[PDB]
Write a protein that binds this ligand. Structure first.
Ligand SMILES: O=C(NC(=O)c1ccccn1)N[C@@H]1O[C@H](CO)[C@@H](O)[C@H](O)[C@H]1O
Ligand SMILES: O=C(NC(=O)c1ccccn1)N[C@@H]1O[C@H](CO)[C@@H](O)[C@H](O)[C@H]1O
Ligand SMILES: *Cc1c(COP(=O)(O)O)cnc(C)c1O
Ligand SMILES: *Cc1c(COP(=O)(O)O)cnc(C)c1O
Lengths: 808, 808
């Protein structure tokens, strides 16, 4: 049908049809009389999977022969979403499969909807890992993603009476056609026990053993015949009254049972610590085994790079030391040199409550040898600090890996910096903040360690897959090369005054909005006006992300309409979605508030279809692929200095939405690339927040001086949005008035004014679209291909390649 | 190579090779450079499985079109063993696959050894179900086996210091290529809750829900293109702080976790009750659904037969009543008529400690509606007893389904008889004992209900598969038709004086013994003399099976040798094997005794290779297939009246061993078929046991009057067989002397004398072999094809058919 989806050749279509029928018969054990749509999905998935296999085997064989430096990306989260369409895109099979299925009397799009999301992540950090795997394969790097195969991913969110309910995400129920179990490569992981000191070094004995069984998933590069591996570990009990002993095997296997959904607040739970060590110990054994199958660990850093996705796999540092010292019998200093040159650490937040600080007593019981190694690392590190800054006793306590207090804790971030040759933030402003504030002491000691690597997204999933209409109109003008070289989008600037292109851009957006408007009715029974401005804020629910500020604007628009009903206003559909961490009370209250506002606004006859407020249920990767292409306005309104980067922001920019946002995280670089004239920038900068903190933030001041703000708080307090429970939102009002860490009121005025300017531009479709073109055209920097090339050259010491491997 | 293994045609071999290579590549994601023997096994298994699929789909389609009466075999145990070779045999693919694998440079026999046993049973009852499935498919019956997919089957037995250790049987670790998960046919099962009475009947409310997910395994008939289904249910939690709720799903899923290994003593554990209801509730829903997919339940018994394998699925009776009365709204009397005509019950023991008597309080909590239904069944049943035997108040209490006492219990056997149109024992003597003793009252009320169905074994697994050498020499003389018509073996009587055949029979036995002798060295590092008489007792360890009597004979032979060292004795290898239930202390002591005897006997230089005592570790179906063809003497020495049938006895008879045995279970009919002159029959008959019980059994009498017996007990007591722990076997001596329910001493003299007669015949190879031929030739009655044809005609009301379905 469309050019970017590849050729539908006579031989390929015929071959796909017959392999489809073979799988339906032999693999699923069905015939056309009993087969359900789910059966058809699986037959197609198996058919597409077959095309990966040859390439997968020869890619790994190629790495064995060429022996390049291997990249190991360690993460507790891989937020993969669906695999079928992505695989078709990367193999150039989409049109052929669409044709083959059409001839069998099936709709491929309908079959795609059957696939479960692989929801093995919370949000941005997990999705970054997924985009990174795609880019590493596309750039021909010998890269492996290592994590945990959770049998339950991020919970499915149900909204019941306006409240979030959590439901188990049983994503493996019907099977996963993409993974291959590798029980033959099972490895032991040790827990508890105690340390003995012999004449020949320390020995970790009397341990409990849990088995780590790998499952391999193929990661295809974009049309280069490269297929890399994501290896996820599953926990298994070893085989050695009777009934209870068998039933107690569950305790060992609980390690890989469920993803921790708490992305706001560090909890210090033993099971989470077990998960972190489990992935680290199994992965490092696998790495060392592969390295030996090429005795001298001097070349270890020449052949291995380990990237730590936040501090979650930070135990890699003392585990590598443990193996090198205790098992390989290397001396401390040489083992340390190897460890530092091998490891690199990526930080994803500056918020102190999110930072991992493990109680010493927990590490003492679970990982006694690792604690001893951490103490030794700390002693030697502090000796270096003391020699560099003699007499600076406070610096010593500030930089210690061991934090003092009621409970002694290990600061995992300090451990990561000490044991890594590179530390990076995820956007320029974030990386600067690391050097100036939370890691200032470390920067002063080792300035060379600190880098920036601004985040990106893959344009395969986030343009070609989810927005084929836009990908096509772009390809018509500038060809197809931009898909793996997104900087080529700049060529679109010479079309900003092209009347045909302006019309095509706006048409693609309109089609996307109608498509999503119909999706909302068919699956959720909600009616929206597709002519309205689609105002979208989708991301996890956090106080810092300021969904509450959005809520205040919504109520402001409603109150203005009620005050002057017969005045024209630009119609809006305000959509907010995202999950709240199960333990986060305030975030759960925020969801309730959103739905409560919707209940009043959506049923006011005076409002009509001029304003609609919808809470987008169960926001996840598959939903993002639908809503983002449909959006007109992207809300990126975190308090300056709090969102390390954001990546949702980049997805919207690539897909033809304009951005209203603060100068926070990657928003700064986005505005810089597009030009500030082409962004809706408002609010305090980082410096303004700092000034207000020195003064002391007093919310009462804003309440007293802004009558429109006062009215909203009075409505919240009095029970306007909750007639049956008048004090329902007292916690929210209290926080806003007395305990607001994120200064919602301080940005309110400028936010509302800026929103008026958005409405003004939307009244002029031609000038709106021209600004959109200026955004899409400058979004190239935010490809994860760029990000990964920077990691490769500046951290891992490897060269990317767009050259294809020979096709089987 | 050999005729009975089928044709190895040029096209079939070429096709098998290419499909093997396809699976290795696409299914296993391997190439010849990395592939292990396990990979090769799986590639072959998938290749063979492909040949089943077409036949499986068209068999089920055939049943849909023809709508025959369906047979549902309900069992908590299916002891299947390995599937690969059995499938090749039944599809006539063995030679073709042997050739195909040979040309790929692989040994098929070596690959067969990689397959895990499906050990979903304890012993005879579980293996009977497996043989029955094979025969039902071979006889063209529309039959379904229903059970539980345990993730852990019968434990693997390790012997450590002479003691049994239990190891979890993780049979699914590497995957099961034979099963097909059917998550789309998942059904809810209810537990706990309470009963409400509305105007319109009873309602079971506030229940806990566990999901039942089916897994289907193909059951191929012997060369008739019939492929039936074994459906096994797996427990799943429904999808609806947070972390713990997810982890607690294990509690629901524990239902299908592990097979109860206690085959000696009923325990009354809640988890076992849950397992029993789980299989019953899911199965009955499936049956009713299939019946409706053909409103009037009058025809239900015309289209459905449910066979209860012991009382384990007895809840089928009140569950069917529950569904018909509470859900379908049929009146009680009509529902009862349908239930009785649908259900039939098979009893497998007379030992009172094995009989299921569930505490009322357990049923009250777990299954409150079922208890109410059971009480109502009981009331109406006792009203019939009272009308038939007026004034007989003791009969009323004896026949009650409710047993009185400290704890009230439900007698599940009484429930089964009341609710079934047919009750059968498993051998003629057993069925008679049921009518005369434990179910005498029920027989007097309803004589027409009581039947015999003598057990059998499948000659596919138990001759063709495990003893191809013997199957071939038989086929040379009488053709191949006997394999599905075992009565044809009688034709072999005209070869009893044939010198060529005598030589061939003895040669096949010698080859089997050398094969097994080498197996013992290669896998267990034990040396045996292949010229010795192979004296074998393999079966679960129970007091009633009298492994202890065998032990006494062994010690007698040892003591006789030590007394007269330079006298000639027929050399013997005495092999004993079998598992003890984990809680059965005496059975565990018996295993220790056997190994302890071996430790003394096997290392006595004066004995040499004239006597060897070996404990066969981890006895299971795959081991049975090896040892039985190698045996010369089969030990079937249970106290008369205690072994309901036995089936191991039949396996040995078919494979060319002579039998030393009591007149118990099926031994009686075996001797009858072969002639008593051709069996080594000894010991008390049932009547003799009864006479001794009236007198009172005094073991001291035997100890006082038999000097050889006295010496053995003195050796046991003094610590002759346990020098370091002199009183190790005091429990055994105490039981034998004071508390022996099974009268070991009473059969000792005749046993030893009879064993002398065995040794005498073994000295004359020609006459030994001629007696063997007389046994093999008359073993036809003991085919499960005969057994199943009798069930079909006399209980289920269906006609068997040897006619083949058209090949795809
Ligand atoms: O998503 C997360 N963390 C978590 O999900 C998380 C999970 C467990 C504990 C702490 N945390 N972090 C996000 O990472 C993205 C990628 O760099 C950035 O764009 C976002 O600015 C950042 O908030
Ligand atoms: O094997 C068993 N029971 C068990 O395994 C068992 C399991 C649980 C509870 C009670 N029991 N029973 C056996 O059944 C065979 C088939 O009819 C007969 O040949 C044997 O004589 C009989 O002992
Ligand atoms: C991109 C993405 C995120 C990250 O969004 P931010 O706005 O950067 O927090 C979270 N969840 C999903 C499903 C995503 O796709
Ligand atoms: C046949 C068989 C049995 C039954 O043997 P009996 O001697 O009849 O108790 C038990 N276990 C296995 C593995 C069998 O094959």
């Amino acid at each position: 049908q469309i050019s970017v989806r590849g050729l539908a050749g006579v031989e390929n279509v015929t071959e796909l049809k017959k392999n489809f029928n073979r799988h339906l018969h032999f693999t699923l054990v069905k015939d056309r009389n009993v087969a359900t749509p789910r059966d058809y999905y699986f037959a197609l998935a198996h058919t597409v999977r077959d095309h990966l296999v040859g390439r997968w085997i020869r890619t790994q064989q190629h790495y064995y022969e060429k022996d390049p430096k291997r990249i190991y990306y360690l993460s507790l989260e891989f937020y993969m979403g669906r695999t079928l369409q992505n695989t078709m895109v990367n193999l150039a099979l989409e049109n052929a499969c669409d044709e083959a299925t059409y001839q069998l009397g099936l709709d491929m799009e309908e079959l795609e909807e059957i696939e479960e999301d692989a929801g093995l992540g919370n949000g941005g950090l997990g999705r970054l890992a997924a985009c990174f795997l795609d880019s590493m394969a596309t750039l021909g790097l010998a890269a492996y993603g290592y994590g945990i195969r959770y049998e339950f991913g991020i919970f499915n969110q149900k909204i019941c009476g306006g409240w979030q309910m959590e439901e188990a995400d049983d994503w493996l129920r019907y099977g996963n056609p993409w993974e291959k179990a590798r029980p033959e490569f099972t490895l032991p992981v040790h827990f508890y026990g105690r340390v003995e000191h012999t004449s020949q070094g320390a020995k970790w004995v009397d341990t409990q053993v849990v088995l780590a069984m790998p499952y391999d998933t193929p990661v295809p590069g974009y049309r280069n015949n490269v297929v890399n591996t994501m290896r996820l570990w599953s926990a298994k009990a070893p085989n050695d009254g009777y009934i209870q002993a068998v039933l107690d095997r569950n305790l060992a296997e609980n390690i890989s049972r469920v993803l921790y959904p708490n992305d706001n607040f560090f909890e210090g739970k033993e099971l989470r610590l077990k998960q972190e060590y489990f992935v680290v110990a199994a992965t490092l054994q696998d790495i060392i085994r592969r390295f030996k199958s090429s005795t001298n660990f001097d070349a270890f850093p020449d052949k291995v790079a380990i990237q730590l996705n936040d501090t979650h796999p930070s135990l890699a540092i003392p585990e590598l030391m443990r193996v090198l010292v205790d098992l390989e019998r290397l001396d401390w200093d040489k083992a340390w040199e190897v460890t530092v040159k091998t490891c690199a650490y990526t930080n994803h937040t500056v918020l102190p409550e999110a930072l991992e600080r493990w109680p010493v007593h927990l590490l003492e019981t679970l990982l006694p040898r690792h604690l001893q190694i951490i103490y030794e690392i700390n002693q030697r590190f502090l000796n270096r600090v003391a020699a560099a800054f003699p007499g600076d006793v406070d610096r010593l306590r500030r930089m210690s890996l061991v934090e003092e207090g009621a409970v002694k804790r290990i600061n995992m971030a300090h451990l990561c910096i000490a044991g890594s040759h590179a530390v990076n933030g995820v956007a320029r402003i974030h990386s600067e903040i690391l050097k100036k504030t939370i890691f200032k002491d470390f920067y002063e000691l080792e300035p060379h360690k600190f880098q920036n690597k601004t985040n990106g997204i893959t344009p395969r999933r986030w343009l070609v897959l989810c927005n084929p209409g836009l990908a096509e109109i772009i390809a018509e003008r500038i060809g197809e090369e931009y898909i793996s070289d997104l900087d080529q989008l700049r060529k679109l600037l010479s079309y900003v005054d092209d009347e045909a292109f302006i019309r095509d851009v706006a048409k693609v957006k309109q089609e996307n909005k109608l498509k999503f408007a119909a999706y909302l009715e068919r699956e959720y029974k909600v009616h929206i006006n597709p002519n309205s401005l689609f105002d979208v804020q989708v991301k996890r629910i956090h106080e810092y992300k300021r969904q509450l500020l959005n809520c205040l604007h919504v109520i402001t628009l409603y109150n203005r309409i009620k005050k002057e009903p017969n005045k024209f206003v630009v119609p809006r559909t305000v959509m907010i979605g995202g999950k709240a961490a199960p333990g986060y009370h305030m975030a759960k209250m925020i969801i309730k508030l959103i739905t409560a506002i919707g209940d009043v606004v959506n049923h006011d006859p005076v409002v009509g279809d001029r304003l609609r407020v919808i809470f987008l249920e169960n926001y996840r990767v598959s939903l993002a692929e639908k809503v983002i292409p449909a959006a007109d306005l992207s809300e990126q309104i975190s308090t300056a200095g709090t969102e390390a980067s954001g990546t949702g922001n980049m997805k919207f920019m690539l897909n033809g939405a304009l951005t209203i946002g603060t100068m926070d995280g990657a928003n700064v670089e986005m505005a810089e690339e597009a030009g500030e004239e082409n962004f809706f920038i408002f609010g305090m900068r980082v410096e303004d927040v700092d000034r207000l903190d020195q003064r002391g933030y007093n919310a009462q001041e804003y309440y007293d001086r802004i009558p429109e703000l006062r009215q909203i708080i009075e409505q919240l307090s009095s029970g306007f949005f909750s007639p049956k429970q008048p004090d329902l939102f007292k916690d929210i009002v209290n926080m806003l008035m007395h305990h607001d860490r994120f200064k919602v009121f301080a940005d309110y005025e400028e936010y509302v004014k800026c929103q008026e300017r958005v409405s003004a531009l939307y009244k002029n479709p031609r000038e709106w679209t021209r600004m959109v073109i200026r955004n899409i055209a400058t979004s190239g920097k935010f490809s994860s291909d760029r990000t990964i090339a920077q990691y490769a050259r500046e951290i891992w010491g490897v060269e990317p390649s767009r050259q294809r491997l020979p096709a089987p």
